Design a protein around this ligand. Structure first.
Ligand SMILES: [Cl-]
Ligand SMILES: [Cl-]
Lengths: 120, 121
């Protein structure tokens, strides 16, 4: 259980990590047993989460935080990604437990899934 | 891509099915290829989703909606379930595509983890 102010803190740090593009910042906010579900792929590790993040960031030329909201212990972040001149929209949901993200839920538009399945 | 007004209609239908009892409304909102992620388990297809949903709702003796919120194509519902005298907080995130729910993400309390394991297994 975390206070409203507690969740807002991680939110601002998650927001700063996305915009500035520092991957180490993102990873430090994840719990060691963080569960990441995105599309058909699922990841159990925190170190595995970092691997998939960097594997995505190596194709992304431009990151842009569109909007950020906080619902209970969830932090939602709308992100636009530019890959090969093309823009894509992703939705991230970070569920926080004890000051760190315990679960990450990412929505992927059908056209994005193609790219993820292509540029894999 | 769906308009803000189109996502709100689904939200109200979702909100209504929670403020009321029947899960028969939520299954009608599900896409045939819907993906439900609860705990470490994932459920694919409306058939498996309607099964998992029904089994869970049969364990719940009381439902209270704490809050509802819309964010892009995502519908968030904060709920309190009561199973065997004990009460648990949960969050439902419904991702909408073309008027139906393509993906459902369910967060549960750590204290509900063992209990959720018994129901689904
Ligand atoms: Cl997109
Ligand atoms: Cl907008």
């Amino acid at each position: 259980h975390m206070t409203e102010e507690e969740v807002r803190k991680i939110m601002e740090k998650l927001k700063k990590a996305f915009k500035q593009g520092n991957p180490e910042q993102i990873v430090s906010l994840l719990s060691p047993d963080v569960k990441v579900d995105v599309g058909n792929q699922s990841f159990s590790g925190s170190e595995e989460a970092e691997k998939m993040w960097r594997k995505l960031m190596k194709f992304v030329d431009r990151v842009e935080v569109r909007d950020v909201r906080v619902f209970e212990n969830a932090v939602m972040i709308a992100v636009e990604f530019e890959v090969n001149g093309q823009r894509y929209k992703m939705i991230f949901t970070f569920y926080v437990e004890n000051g760190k993200v315990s679960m990450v839920s990412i929505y992927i538009s059908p056209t994005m899934k193609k790219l993820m399945k292509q540029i894999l």
